[PDB]
Design a protein around this ligand. Structure first.
Ligand SMILES: CCCCCCCCCCCCCCCCCCCC(=O)O[C@H](COC(=O)CCCCCCCCCCCCCC)COP(=O)(O)OCCN
Ligand SMILES: CCCCCCCCCCCCCCCCCCCC(=O)O[C@H](COC(=O)CCCCCCCCCCCCCC)COP(=O)(O)OCCN
Ligand SMILES: CCCCCCCCCCCCCCCCCCCC(=O)O[C@H](COC(=O)CCCCCCCCCCCCCC)COP(=O)(O)OCCN
Ligand SMILES: CCCCCCCCCCCCCCCCCCCC(=O)O[C@H](COC(=O)CCCCCCCCCCCCCC)COP(=O)(O)OCCN
Ligand SMILES: CC(C)CCC[C@@H](C)[C@H]1CC[C@H]2[C@@H]3CC=C4C[C@@H](O)CC[C@]4(C)[C@H]3CC[C@]12C
Ligand SMILES: CC(C)CCC[C@@H](C)[C@H]1CC[C@H]2[C@@H]3CC=C4C[C@@H](O)CC[C@]4(C)[C@H]3CC[C@]12C
Ligand SMILES: CC(C)CCC[C@@H](C)[C@H]1CC[C@H]2[C@@H]3CC=C4C[C@@H](O)CC[C@]4(C)[C@H]3CC[C@]12C
Ligand SMILES: CC(C)CCC[C@@H](C)[C@H]1CC[C@H]2[C@@H]3CC=C4C[C@@H](O)CC[C@]4(C)[C@H]3CC[C@]12C
Ligand SMILES: CC(C)CCC[C@@H](C)[C@H]1CC[C@H]2[C@@H]3CC=C4C[C@@H](O)CC[C@]4(C)[C@H]3CC[C@]12C
Ligand SMILES: CC(C)CCC[C@@H](C)[C@H]1CC[C@H]2[C@@H]3CC=C4C[C@@H](O)CC[C@]4(C)[C@H]3CC[C@]12C
Ligand SMILES: CC(C)CCC[C@@H](C)[C@H]1CC[C@H]2[C@@H]3CC=C4C[C@@H](O)CC[C@]4(C)[C@H]3CC[C@]12C
Ligand SMILES: CC(C)CCC[C@@H](C)[C@H]1CC[C@H]2[C@@H]3CC=C4C[C@@H](O)CC[C@]4(C)[C@H]3CC[C@]12C
Ligand SMILES: *[C@@H]1O[C@H](CO)[C@@H](O)[C@H](O)[C@H]1NC(C)=O
Ligand SMILES: *[C@@H]1O[C@H](CO)[C@@H](O)[C@H](O)[C@H]1NC(C)=O
Ligand SMILES: *[C@@H]1O[C@H](CO)[C@@H](O)[C@H](O)[C@H]1NC(C)=O
Ligand SMILES: *[C@@H]1O[C@H](CO)[C@@H](O)[C@H](O)[C@H]1NC(C)=O
Lengths: 344, 344, 344, 344
């Protein structure tokens, strides 16, 4: 039913499931905005397909041709289904709007499903190509940060009672390589292109006269060509075309609202702000150098991924609260770090 | 519904499930490109079968013959079903396009399912013949790499405060044997042949006049041969033939796009690049010799499998980050290895 | 739907489920070739049954008799169902092909299910009679091999820094007893006989004229015997008979391709090759004697089972890699064994 | 569908599920032959019921009466259902075969279900009355055997570097009591009686003329008794009666084949052979006395249960392999026991 479809597609974890594998434990592997965009762009057309043929909104068959009274119910079914299959056969029907409107009315669910699949494709390519590498690198970064925080707190405790910047060097090296950012940008751009094409198609579908669903149908090919009792033509109407138009304009509105989000996601360096690593700069064991900004490189993407999935790190949380308390300046950063005792 | 089929076949883990057994824990056993190719080539025809008979796109019965008005609904059903079963009986029907078009229109779902099964067969043969052996060998290689990394870091720590290349010898021995690569190439070639045959069939199906679905049917065998009230013949149309043609051309496009991927996978030595073992060459306990390239042997396949499923190895990840930092050259490889302290 | 049936019967673990019990943990208990043969021979006829009555390929009812126009729809249903039930009643119908073709057309799903059950019976007898014993014996053999490997490596380590061949004696004793091999051969032979009988039946079914589905039906027994308004006879056609013939020839092709596999499995001693125990002959604690070949005894079957399910043994894997490295001969077997340190 | 029913009833664990409780962990509680007999005798009639009304074999309604053409479809439905309900009302119908054939044709599924329930009853009584006691006793016996084996191996190791026969005394005491064997024999005898009664009924059902399904029906009681437009009687046929007869003869064949198995299971002392305890007689800590044979007592039943579910005992497996090696006589039993080191 309508409610079941809603629960499946909006109120449930449709495409929101975390990776079902121990490799990615607690790692999103996908930005929240991108996940929202993909979920909307994929599960909206599916939801509209399901709604358009719901047991309640749907009167019944998808086409009726109004055969003469003399025709039996089976002859009427023959006429209806013949015209349904003959929307593609151009000679069979003669409609003012043409034959493309009939093609579109018959295959609208297929086109919506195609758009959903094409929008889900780039996310899947990301997941199966660039997600494992970024996940491994981010796990390494998290482990390095936790280890350096533990070493710093241990040193502070020893004072009260190697030292090489491996992670910073790794980030600096990542500053040059840009394959990951290139893949991300290409996926976002393809998603935007697919969304714009879908908007064009939906606008064309919704701009129709709304009478193109009605077409003239002629069962007059073969032995029935010269038959007399059969009328020369029939009046057929494609049902649910208005519902398709309504759902198409709804999807068009959603996609036009979503496209600005897509271009914003494409403009990654502007998103690269609120330095996550600035918090760690107070640790004696961590070098005071962020050096991550203003670059169309994988470093900005890694910074965004950290800002997205760093709240799960206890050391980062402790450093963040220490910096927050430093806003007043009443205490001292090393004293607060020693007092916290948050190694694990 | 359409959306349920889409969720099952594209947005879910259809054929993407990892082995349900402790023997293969975290091991793909299949290259990402090959898994994509198999998933597409198998779940596309199934998806098209499901779509073609969806409750919405489908008007109703698969054939209607337009019996005279005098005929009852049961007589009409008899005529329709008789012609449905008589598409195979050549004498019963007389169609301009012949009888093969009618056979194909009636059995298109069967042919798509046959193609899906034939494309899934080589992957299954791989899984049940060559996957256990490669999995065991790769687990041995991973264990050897982890052990040698642990020994190297322990030796470095001891210095700061056997030695036989077993894995390299095993790889060198694998360089000669080629049964695994032969099986892989044979499976890929059979998949390519099946895909090309499917493309030929789909092109033939889509090249039909689109009027071959209409055939003349004669219920005039037996006691009804000389009956007068029954007309000498009927006008029958095979419904969903246009939808079958649309889906067949879609599958043809997908398969022609996919075949280049298949030939690329077949050309394995060119894929054999970005030496995974080059990272380990800096370890004192590991001999500095890759010796894996330019060969139609199982060694290249093992190299590809390593490059595919080596990101899960912490020692390999540490070595990779060490080499990445070595790009700048600021530090020293042994110093970085000692500082990392990433035994486990 | 067709796709759901395919996913259930070919793309899922249909009859491929490992034993759901702790007694057999990681043990196949069945050769890969035999499992493939059983899975095909069982799930093919079931798949064909499901396909033949699929919602898409199936026009509707399984028989239509074309009652006169004057007959009501309920009278038509009576005639159709009466003839359906009277295919068995010989006097009721008069068909040129006889009555056995009608019996077969009506009961084809039952016959396919019977063949599937009869082919699944010998595997089930194997599982519930001979599988526990072989599983226990093979677990004992694996434990003995692991223990002797551990003792050998411990002795080598002690040198660097009982001894009775219990497993070999057990294998030698098994050389005489042949109940297990006799049961295996009997099951394979019964499977082959059932397959050949199924091939004969399917060939007979597919060799029919294809017009035997049409039979003349007479509702003229009882009070209707002398009734005038009812015609003396009707023209009935058994629907899906052509689909049954197509599926039967497909199953015939599959079974004729499979029977050579069955005879190959029956010829077990020829399969008994690539001595699995030859690898263990280099261990000082293991006697250098294979003594397992050229015998219609349970020893060959045990050798096959070992070759099938020995890859899970770490000691066997280590010995295999040691022998593989010995192909070059650069190193020494005891030195490699000491260096491996693969006790557990 | 047919295939789904087959998978549920033959290819799945129908009545083969082990007890879902920690009390019986790895204990069958039921002999393999008895479990097979019960599973067949219960799930065969259910399978036949399901098959007889399958969506494919079933034409439609279970009865059709061929009301005159003037009758509406609702009047025809009234006549059909009235006759369906009036098969029991003797005055309403007049059939040559009588009224018992019609009763049986209408209630065949009920009778098959009754036979299945009556055959499942004795197994359930066994499970809920005698299974816990035998399970506890057998667990005690297994624990005693494991303890004595451990003590014997410990004594042998001590020599190289109480003693009361509690289990044998318990078995000797069990030799007298016979309530368990009496219950087992009574259950088997009741199963045999039910099977024979089912065979008699199925033979009577299959021996019918096959025209007894056709009966004359009279809707002439009440206000319709003197009505003129309604014919004095109708020609009704009970559909699926031939299918019921086919399935009944199949079940008869299965049951007649099964009854010899039942009488063999009833003759338990002859089954009591291949002394399981003879293997333990070589242990110094175990008295050399089997004393279990030739008795209609619970001791033979316990011996059978041990022979059925003793393969899971590591001590028994070790003793069995020791005795097997003793066939050659090359070594010594105590030496082999010491070398095995299989305490746990
Ligand atoms: C994806 C969205 C595709 C929408 C755009 C399609 C481009 C069509 C261009 C060709 C038009 C053409 O040949 O002219 C019309 C016939 O179209 C035709 O006969 C071709 C119709 C185009 C196919 C529509 C069906 C799409 C099915 C999608 C299936 C996806 C499934 C994926 C799993 C004639 O009529 P007129 O009115 O233009 O002129 C009539 C008066 N001159
Ligand atoms: C797989 C794809 C197979 C497609 C190619 C089939 C090759 C057919 C060649 C024989 C053609 C033949 O005998 O001639 C036609 C009759 O065909 C026939 O009567 C034979 C039709 C071929 C069988 C088609 C049904 C395939 C069913 C697949 C089931 C798979 C299920 C697996 C679980 C005559 O007619 P015309 O038009 O050629 O000439 C008519 C004017 N001379
Ligand atoms: C299993 C496959 C069995 C196939 C072979 C059956 C052997 C039949 C031999 C008897 C033939 C016979 O009596 O002659 C025909 C009548 O057959 C009959 O009336 C008997 C028909 C045989 C039974 C077919 C139904 C099998 C049902 C399988 C159910 C399995 C379910 C398991 C859960 C007459 O006709 P004609 O054409 O031969 O001669 C007519 C002109 N003289
Ligand atoms: C269990 C299997 C039972 C089969 C044997 C039933 C014994 C019937 C003996 C009484 C026969 C009787 O009174 O005579 C017939 C009427 O039967 C009747 O009117 C009584 C019919 C017997 C009941 C059959 C229905 C069984 C329902 C089982 C339900 C199980 C559900 C469990 C959950 C007359 O007709 P005629 O042809 O004998 O003579 C007609 C010319 N003198
Ligand atoms: C998803 C993408 C490919 C959709 C592209 C736009 C589609 C939906 C529509 C929008 C406007 C349409 C065009 C409008 C006008 C004409 C002129 C006519 O004589 C032939 C068809 C043609 C040329 C149409 C083809 C299809 C069209 C391009
Ligand atoms: C992403 C944004 C830009 C989408 C907004 C929808 C736009 C593109 C839609 C809305 C109305 C549409 C037009 C409606 C009518 C016609 C006439 C037809 O003969 C050619 C196409 C044409 C000219 C359409 C082109 C696309 C169109 C302009
Ligand atoms: C999956 C594989 C086997 C499909 C092979 C191609 C099939 C689909 C088609 C493509 C072209 C077809 C052929 C085209 C023309 C003819 C000539 C005619 O007088 C007999 C049939 C015959 C000989 C056809 C047989 C079937 C055919 C070969
Ligand atoms: C994998 C690639 C090559 C597939 C491309 C589809 C090709 C093979 C298709 C497209 C159109 C097809 C042709 C269409 C019409 C006919 C006429 C018929 O009487 C014989 C087959 C023949 C000549 C077909 C052969 C196959 C064909 C050429
Ligand atoms: C599964 C096994 C039992 C099937 C055995 C073969 C079956 C399918 C068929 C193949 C050929 C058939 C026979 C062919 C010819 C005749 C002669 C006829 O006057 C009586 C039936 C009889 C004797 C048939 C009986 C059934 C038969 C034996
Ligand atoms: C496993 C292999 C051998 C199976 C091959 C199928 C064979 C056995 C099939 C194919 C055609 C069949 C024949 C077709 C027609 C008839 C005529 C009939 O009156 C008697 C049976 C007989 C003579 C059949 C016997 C079985 C048959 C020869
Ligand atoms: C399950 C058990 C109870 C079934 C017992 C057998 C049943 C199926 C059948 C087999 C033979 C049958 C009997 C055959 C003949 C007659 C004579 C008739 O004038 C009255 C019914 C009576 C007496 C039948 C009663 C039912 C009967 C006993
Ligand atoms: C377990 C074994 C013995 C079952 C074998 C089935 C036997 C018992 C069946 C097969 C044919 C049957 C007979 C068929 C016909 C009749 C005539 C009827 O008026 C009385 C019952 C009677 C005489 C049946 C009694 C039971 C019967 C003999
Ligand atoms: C129908 O009748 C017309 C009359 O002109 C004729 O041309 C045509 O061939 C006929 N069609 C058939 C199928 O006979
Ligand atoms: C039908 O009538 C024709 C008239 O020529 C005759 O040849 C044929 O045998 C008849 N068919 C039947 C089944 O009697
Ligand atoms: C039908 O009428 C015929 C006329 O010969 C007669 O023999 C037969 O008995 C009648 N049938 C019935 C059921 O009265
Ligand atoms: C039907 O009519 C008959 C005529 O004899 C009469 O006996 C009977 O009572 C009537 N039935 C009813 C229900 O009035």
């Amino acid at each position: 039913a309508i409610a079941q479809l809603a629960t499946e597609y909006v109120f449930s974890d449709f495409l929101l499931k975390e990776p079902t594998e121990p490799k990615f434990k607690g790692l999103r592997l996908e930005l929240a905005v991108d996940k929202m965009v993909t979920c909307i762009a994929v599960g909206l057309p599916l939801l509209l397909i399901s709604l358009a043929f719901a047991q309640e909104i749907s009167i019944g068959t998808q086409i009726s041709c109004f055969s003469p009274s003399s025709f039996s119910w089976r002859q009427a079914a023959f006429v209806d289904s013949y015209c349904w299959a003959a929307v593609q056969q151009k000679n069979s029907l003669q409609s003012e709007s043409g034959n493309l409107p009939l093609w579109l009315h018959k295959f609208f669910p297929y086109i919506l499903l195609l758009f959903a699949i094409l929008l889900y494709l780039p996310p899947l390519f990301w997941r199966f190509a660039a997600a494992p590498h970024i996940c491994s690198d981010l796990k390494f970064i998290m482990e390095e940060l936790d280890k350096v925080y533990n070493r710093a707190i241990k040193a502070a405790k020893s004072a009260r009672d190697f030292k090489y910047p491996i992670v910073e060097q790794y980030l600096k090296t990542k500053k040059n390589s840009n394959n990951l950012i290139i893949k991300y940008i290409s996926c976002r751009l393809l998603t935007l292109i697919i969304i714009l094409l879908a908007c064009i198609y939906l606008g064309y579908y919704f701009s129709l006269s709304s009478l193109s669903d009605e077409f003239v149908c002629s069962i007059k090919s073969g032995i029935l060509r010269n038959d007399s009792t059969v009328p020369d033509q029939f009046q057929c109407k494609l049902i649910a075309v208005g519902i398709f138009q309504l759902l198409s304009v709804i999807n068009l509105v959603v996609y036009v609202l979503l496209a600005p989000v897509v271009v914003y996601t494409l403009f990654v360096p502007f998103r690269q702000k609120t330095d996550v690593l600035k918090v760690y700069e107070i640790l004696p064991t961590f070098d005071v150098l962020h050096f991550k900004s203003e670059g169309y490189n994988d470093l900005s993407l890694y910074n965004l991924f950290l800002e997205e999935n760093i709240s799960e790190v206890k050391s980062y949380k402790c450093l963040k609260v220490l910096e927050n308390i430093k806003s007043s300046g009443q205490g001292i950063d090393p004293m607060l770090l020693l007092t916290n005792l948050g190694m694990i």
